Structures are given as structure tokens and as C-alpha cells.
């Protein structure tokens, strides 16, 4: 009802606090704009009040948890899942290439400027330890998206 299986809720849960500064249990525009900007879009002031307008949950410039994703959930309905995953990589990959690093986890959140500790990431870093090196390119980055 509120919390599902770890990886099932893993995205919208964590992406629940992404926007929610106030968190009346909804998502506001001032948040949705602070979000988008980190993906490489035109930083507009109305973009957030506009983005919640068409995907209006409450229409007071607030979007709920089942609506914000309705577009990625749409990619679940539509078979456009093949051409998006490579551009969805570009989201973080501003280098147009992408290299193997488990440290990437810390660059995505700091791309927004999130604050984490050395031990927080020592676990989030070890939560991705591969072969014994600890780096991960587009292989695990896309698989992160392709896997449910």
C-alpha cells in the first residue's frame, strides 16, 4: 500500500524525496524544475508549472507518485523502449561515451548536488563491486534501466 519490494519501490521511493522538499505527499513545480535541469533541458521557470499542467495530478502544480512516471510507464506500454535507453544514457553521459565507474552513483546525485558520506557510498560503492575492480559502463547503466 505504501512500501513494496525493495527494487519495485526502489525508483519512485528514492525519487519521492528527489522532488519533495516540503513533501505534503505530492510533487510541486518548484521541485520538478530543480529535477529536469540536471538532464540537459532548457531551464524554464514555467517549465515546472507547465510540466505539471499537462500531467496534472492535483493541478495546483503538483504531481503524485503514479503520474510522474506515467511517461516511463508509457515506455512500458509503447515499444519505444529500444531508442530511449541509449539517449536515457546520455542523461548522465554528457561525454557521449560512458566509462566503467561505480563512482558514477556519486556523480549522478552530485550532478544535482546531493550530499553523501564516504561510508554511505562505501556501501553504495560496494553495492556495485564487479569482478573486484568496482567500475561500470553503459553495460550495467542500461541494464539498470532494462531490468525490473
Amino acid at each position: 500500500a505504501d512500501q513494496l519490494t525493495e527494487e519495485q519501490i526502489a525508483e519512485f521511493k528514492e525519487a519521492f524525496s528527489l522532488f519533495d522538499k516540503d513533501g505534503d505527499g505530492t510533487i510541486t513545480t518548484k521541485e520538478l524544475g530543480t529535477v529536469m535541469r540536471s538532464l540537459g533541458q532548457n531551464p524554464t521557470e514555467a517549465e515546472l508549472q507547465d510540466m505539471i499542467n499537462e500531467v496534472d495530478a492535483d493541478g495546483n502544480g503538483t504531481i503524485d507518485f503514479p503520474e510522474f512516471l506515467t511517461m516511463m510507464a508509457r515506455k512500458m506500454k509503447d515499444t519505444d523502449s529500444e531508442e530511449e535507453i541509449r539517449e536515457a544514457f546520455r542523461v548522465f553521459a554528457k561525454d557521449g561515451n560512458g566509462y566503467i565507474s561505480a563512482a558514477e552513483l556519486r556523480h549522478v546525485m552530485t550532478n544535482l548536488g546531493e550530499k553523501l558520506t564516504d561510508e554511505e557510498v562505501d556501501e553504495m560503492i560496494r553495492e556495485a563491486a564487479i569482478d573486484g575492480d568496482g567500475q561500470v559502463n553503459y553495460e550495467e547503466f542500461v541494464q539498470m534501466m532494462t531490468a525490473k
Binding site: 526502489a10 525508483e11 525519487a15 512516471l69 536515457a88 542523461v91 558514477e104 539498470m144
Partner: peptide, 29 residues
């Protein structure tokens, strides 16, 4: 052919990027 069999000990992230592959659909041109 070659078996490896993965093991489960720690939980995955699937958000610190998924919450970025999710918003990459709002205005994908």
C-alpha cells in the same frame, strides 16, 4: 560452455540513475 552462477549479498541502487532514466522521457524531442 562456462558457468559462473551469481551470488546475492547486498541490495542494488536502481534509482540513482533510474530516477534519471525516468525523467528522460518527459521531453525527449
Amino acid at each position: 560452455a562456462g558457468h559462473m552462477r551469481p551470488k546475492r549479498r547486498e541490495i542494488p541502487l536502481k534509482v540513482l540513475v533510474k530516477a534519471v532514466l525516468f525523467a528522460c522521457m518527459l521531453m525527449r524531442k
